[PDB]
Amino acid sequence: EQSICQARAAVMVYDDANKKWVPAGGSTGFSRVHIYHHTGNNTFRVVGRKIQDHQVVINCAIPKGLKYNQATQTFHQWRDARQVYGLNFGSKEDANVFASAMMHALEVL
């Protein structure tokens, strides 16, 4: 697996029952978020680890056809059949880097 981008963001998941965003892994703070490319079968995954204690807070597949919503210039989100994910980026540059890699992955899938 090869990393195609690194971006700083607070990883959130939506708690629909309470209509509230909550920190991924239950750990508030920023993470280093990668998109990893597995060339063997041309698959991509979003993997993020807390800057402080290195806990993996997100490890989710990027499926072909995903709708990646750039809600704001610093908060992007997407959903799968089970959860809604949100990335509150530390800067617009981080958001642009990550969106570029995401949009690339969705183009080559």
């Binding site: 607070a10 965003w21 919503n69 989100q77």
Partner: peptide, 8 residues
């Protein structure tokens, strides 16, 4: 798709 400091 859902739309705070309280949450952060």
């Amino acid at each position: 798709x859902p739309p705070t400091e309280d949450e952060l």
